[PDB]
A paper describes a structure:
In cyanobacteria, carotenoid-dependent non-photochemical quenching is mediated by a unique class of water-soluble carotenoid-binding proteins, the homologs of the Orange Carotenoid Protein (OCP). In the compact dark-adapted orange state (OCPO), the ketocarotenoid is enclosed by two protein domains of about equal size: an all α-helical N-terminal domain (NTD) and a mixed α-helical/β-sheet C-terminal domain (CTD). Upon photoactivation, OCP converts into the physiologically active red state (OCPR) via the formation of numerous intermediates, and the quantum yield of OCPR formation is extremely low (about 0.2%). ICT signatures are valuable indicators for the contribution of the carbonyl group(s) to the conjugated system, and might inform on the configuration of the carotenoid end rings. These effects are of particular interest for the chromophores embedded in OCP since the only specific carotenoid-protein interactions in the OCPO state are two short and strong hydrogen bonds between the 4-keto oxygen of the carotenoid and two hydrogens in the CTD, one belonging to the Tyr-201 hydroxyl group and another to the N-H group of Trp-288 (numbering corresponds to the OCP sequence of Synechocystis sp. PCC 6803).
A 1.37 Å crystal structure of OCP Y201W combined with femtosecond time-resolved absorption spectroscopy, kinetic analysis, and deconvolution of the spectral intermediates, as well as extensive quantum chemical calculations incorporating the effect of the local electric field, highlighted the role of charge-transfer states during OCP photoconversion. To elucidate possible reasons behind the spectral heterogeneity of OCP in its compact orange state, we determined the atomic structure of OCPWW. It crystallized at three different pH values in the same space group P3221, giving three structures with resolutions from 1.37 Å (pH 6.5) to 1.49 Å (pH 5.5). The position and conformation of Trp-288 are identical in WT and OCPWW, indicating the presence of a strong hydrogen bond between the keto oxygen and Trp-288 (the distance between the carotenoid’s keto oxygen and the nitrogen of Trp-288 is 2.9 Å). The electron density for the residue 201 reveals two alternative conformations of the engineered Trp in this position with nearly identical occupancies, nicely supported at this high level of spatial resolution. One Trp-201 conformation has the nitrogen oriented towards the keto group of the carotenoid (‘IN’ conformation), presumably enabling the formation of a weaker hydrogen bond with a distance of 3.2 Å. In the second Trp-201 conformation (‘OUT’), the side chain is rotated by 180° roughly in the same plane, which is incompatible with a hydrogen bond to the keto oxygen of ECN. Analysis of Fo-Fo difference maps shows that IN and OUT Trp-201 rotamers have identical occupancy (within experimental error) each at all probed pHs.
Numbering used by the authors: 3 to 164, 169 to 259, 262 to 313
């Protein structure tokens, strides 16, 4: 067993690989087309999906960069936003690259508000997308909401130029007395239940003790994150205030055990308004420690167990 071979457990699991496909197509576009396409997607999605305000700490961390753009003339504002999309080497692009996903998302949330209000240079009136860009937007608009928000997040994360790391403060774990316990049809495995419950409580120090020293976590469409230091950093930087709603699973006992669970996850960016269809694929060692866990965004609800 290696981490890279563990990636192959439960090969029937059909991931929503239209998400990375669509990001690859998006990545080819002209920068002005990239910005305009996301503006159109975001405006249309906002007719039915309510996005949460960025956290106060996040907005403080992004404040100096946002102020710099706000002080620019309109041509320079457009150029700064194009620099980010083009992954140009500029001071702003390097600052942006140092930020956690949530800080990048909050930065663009604020620019979108300012563009709507007309205080930052908007997408030009009457703007027409390129041939390739129109088709990329059509693909996004045909996706389930959970896939759409994953495309937007990955587009945002990929901008800027790459190192110092800036992230939001780590919230205290949920008080013991108020914590929920999940139930999973077919799965009583204590490691899997404790995984779900500790993540739901933001209890990352308890969560990390479930792993082997060489264990890995593979987020959707990302390479495995290997070892307790890197996995705990990922938890603290990117995994706060999720709600995991596992539904059902299957347990296949080497003394190792493979377990697959399907259900839904909510991000604090959308709360109950977007339920992403998710699989968890666990490979546990004989002592019950996590050697490998993958989290997959599923192609459709038809992929739930
Ligand atoms: C750019 C841009 C603009 C603004 C864009 C904005 C503002 C977009 C905002 C998008 C947002 C806010 C998206 C949020 C997505 C969040 C997601 C998709 C979260 C998924 C999390 C998952 C699936 C976690 C699962 C996990 C589980 C379950 C585990 O068990 C272990 C941990 C982990 C793996 C993490 C404007 C309009 C100005 C136009 C110009 C360009
Ligand atoms: N950073 C943690 C590491 C840890 C080990 N187990 C749980 N957490 C600590 O200071 O203790
Ligand atoms: Cl999130």
């Amino acid at each position: 067993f290696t981490i890279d071979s563990a990636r192959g457990i439960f090969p029937n699991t059909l991931a929503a690989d239209v998400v990375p496909a669509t990001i690859a197509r998006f990545s080819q576009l002209n920068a002005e087309d990239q910005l305009a396409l996301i503006w159109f997607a975001y405006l249309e999605m906002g007719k039915t999906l309510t996005i949460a305000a960025p956290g106060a700490a996040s907005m403080q961390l992004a404040e100096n960069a946002l102020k710099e753009i706000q002080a620019m003339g309109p041509l320079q504002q457009t150029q700064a936003m194009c620099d980010l999309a083009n992954r140009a080497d500029t001071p702003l692009c390097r600052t942006y690259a140092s930020w956690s996903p949530n800080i990048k998302l909050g930065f663009w949330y604020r620019l979108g508000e300012l563009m709507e209000q007309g205080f930052v240079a908007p997408i030009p009136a009457g703007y027409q997308l390129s041939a390739n860009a129109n088709a990329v937007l059509a693909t996004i608009q045909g996706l389930e909401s959970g896939q759409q928000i994953t495309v937007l997040r990955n587009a945002v994360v990929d901008m800027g130029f790459t190192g110092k790391r800036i992230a939001e403060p780590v919230v205290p774990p949920q008080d013991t007395a108020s914590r929920t316990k999940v139930s999973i049809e077919g799965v009583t495995n204590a490691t899997v239940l404790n995984w779900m419950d500790n993540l739901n409580a933001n209890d990352f120090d308890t969560l990390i003790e479930l792993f082997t020293s060489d264990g890995a976590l593979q987020p959707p469409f990302q390479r495995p994150i290997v070892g307790k230091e890197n996995v705990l950093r990922f938890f603290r930087e990117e995994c706060q205030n999720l709600k995991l709603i596992p539904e059902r699973g299957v347990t296949e006992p080497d003394g190792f055990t493979q377990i697959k669970v399907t259900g839904k996850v909510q991000t604090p960016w959308f709360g109950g308004n977007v339920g992403m269809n998710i699989a968890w694929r666990f490979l546990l060692n004989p002592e019950g420690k996590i050697f490998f866990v993958a989290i997959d965004l599923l192609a459709s609800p038809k992929e739930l167990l």
